[PDB]
Write a protein that binds this ligand. Structure first.
Ligand SMILES: Nc1ncnc2c1ncn2[C@@H]1O[C@H](CSCC[C@H](N)C(=O)O)[C@@H](O)[C@H]1O
Ligand SMILES: OC[C@@]1(O)OC[C@@H](O)[C@@H](O)[C@@H]1O
Ligand SMILES: OC[C@H]1O[C@H](O)[C@H](O)[C@@H](O)[C@@H]1O
Ligand SMILES: OC[C@H]1O[C@H](O)[C@H](O)[C@@H](O)[C@@H]1O
Ligand SMILES: [Cl-]
Ligand SMILES: [Mg+2]
Ligand SMILES: [Mg+2]
Ligand SMILES: [Zn+2]
Ligand SMILES: [Zn+2]
Lengths: 114, 299
RNA sequence: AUU
């Protein structure tokens, strides 16, 4: 047995649940690379940058990270969230994947397919 | 519309520091007024951004592999907005440790949870930031005297664990202050009390010590200096302003690559003191960073 | 003090 926090949060949102609040939005130029997870805020004109740990479901719920060493890919970094989805950064990082080639979010910046 | 409105905040002017005022009640003309911040920005992201923008104007030592410790980094939100801003401001790779009495989610390299008096470090630090405030300070039932608690720990931590050439930013308010901390400001090449423009409706200020000398360059009476600070705040209303938050193009702390060397107490001559005073030298060992929190065991 |  193991608790499935990711599925629980997705089911909560589908039921009309209020997104996790207090994700830490940073002040930045909005002239950044637009990559998904960076060492410093890299929001472009279509994104908001947030402190990574505050957007991590596992960090915020105080639960183990889902991988052998329990490593967090967000803590200590900055996550770029499309402005249209900035109302729920935890849900966005949980439901989306980063392109291992260009570093952009698949469907929100990655143009490797074209 | 005031010229100081485009700055990140206001520093206590030199002539106010030279007075001998008696302590009076703080009575700000705009006390408690709320600032209009950029959409979705937290007060402490705005406040720490303005503190860092002001620290950018000073002669901070910025060595490679800089070490920074942040006390009072937690919040009632369960996250660390100030730590997130410090992480953004400091050069990539800077070691950042944060701490708080209560558990919280942090972007720091390492977080210690417990009373700051339980925190021990084998290493010295290049920058100490404190935003600690004791909630009991709100219960004012007697004359406003110098406070002990975490301030006692901070004065000892600065004297034992701050590298020569290092700097500090320690938050104070009308009632949250310590006379020995003001006295220690005289052990730096320069010091001030800095008020952020976004929280100018508060008696809050950051006591900034720039370039630690490890010895008094001037004798400061802390009771008199806090009275001088309150007199300055009572006679100089500051207009709330978020103007500086809109231009982040020059925000990151410049990597100066400041020299780090280990010198015994006796090799610190006037030539070394001059380099320390100009932000061109950090004196400390460069051993591995090891920290711990003492745990009291009970049934 | 955590607007
Ligand atoms: N003795 C002590 N040791 C450690 N932390 C203390 C303390 N006294 C007060 N504090 C902490 O000081 C903090 C003040 S609120 C700090 C806000 C935070 N800097 C931010 O970025 O939002 C509280 O979290 C409180 O727990
Ligand atoms: O977590 C998302 C967010 O928009 O929720 C409401 C407020 O807490 C904001 O500061 C926060 O960024
Ligand atoms: O660490 C954060 C907590 O401690 C602080 O002292 C505050 O009084 C409290 O509101 C907050 O929840
Ligand atoms: O709301 C009071 C003031 O707060 C904000 O910080 C703004 O800089 C200013 O435009 C506004 O008038
Ligand atoms: Cl300076
Ligand atoms: Mg609040
Ligand atoms: Mg305020
Ligand atoms: Zn995490
Ligand atoms: Zn791609």
């Amino acid at each position: 047995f193991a608790v499935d926090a990711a599925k629980a949060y997705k089911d909560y949102l589908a039921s009309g649940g209020q997104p996790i609040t207090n994700c830490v939005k940073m002040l930045c130029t909005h002239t950044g690379t637009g990559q998904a997870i960076t060492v410093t805020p890299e929001a472009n004109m279509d994104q908001e940058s947030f402190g990574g740990a505050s957007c991590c479901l596992y960090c915020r719920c105080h639960i183990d990270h889902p991988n052998p060493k329990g490593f967090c890919d967000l803590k200590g970094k900055y996550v770029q969230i499309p402005t249209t989805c900035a109302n729920d950064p935890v849900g966005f990082t949980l439901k989306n994947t980063v392109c291992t080639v260009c570093g952009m979010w698949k469907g929100y910046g990655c143009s490797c397919d074209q | 519309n005031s010229s100081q409105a485009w700055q990140p905040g206001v520093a206590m002017p030199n002539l106010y520091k030279m007075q001998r005022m008696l302590l009076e009640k703080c009575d700000l003309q705009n006390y408690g007024d709320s600032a209009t911040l950029p959409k979705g920005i937290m007060m402490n992201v705005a406040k720490y951004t303005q503190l860092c923008q002001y620290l950018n104007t000073l002669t901070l030592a910025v060595p490679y592999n800089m070490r920074v410790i942040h006390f009072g980094a937690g919040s009632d939100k369960g996250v660390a907005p100030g730590t997130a801003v410090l992480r953004q401001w400091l050069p990539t790779g800077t070691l950042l440790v944060d701490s708080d009495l209560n558990d919280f989610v942090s972007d720091a390299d390492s977080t210690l949870i417990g009373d700051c008096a339980t925190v021990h470090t084998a290493n010295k630090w290049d920058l100490i930031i404190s935003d600690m405030y004791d909630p009991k300070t709100k219960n004012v039932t007697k004359e406003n005297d110098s406070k002990e608690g975490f301030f006692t720990y901070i004065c000892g931590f600065i004297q034992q664990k701050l590298a020569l050439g290092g700097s500090v930013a320690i938050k104070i308010t009308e009632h949250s202050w310590n006379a020995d901390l003001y006295k220690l400001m005289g052990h730096f090449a320069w010091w001030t009390a800095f008020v952020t423009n976004v929280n100018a409706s508060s008696s809050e200020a950051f006591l900034i010590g720039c370039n630690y000398l490890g010895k008094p360059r001037e004798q400061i009476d802390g009771y008199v200096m806090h009275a001088n600070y309150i007199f300055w705040r009572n006679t100089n209303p500051i207009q709330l302003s978020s103007y500086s938050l809109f231009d982040m193009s020059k925000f990151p702390l410049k990597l100066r690559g400041t020299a780090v060397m280990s010198l015994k107490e006796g090799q610190i001559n006037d030539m070394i003191l001059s380099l320390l005073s100009k932000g061109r030298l950090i004196i400390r060992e460069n051993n591995r960073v090891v920290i711990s929190s003492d745990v009291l065991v009970n049934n």
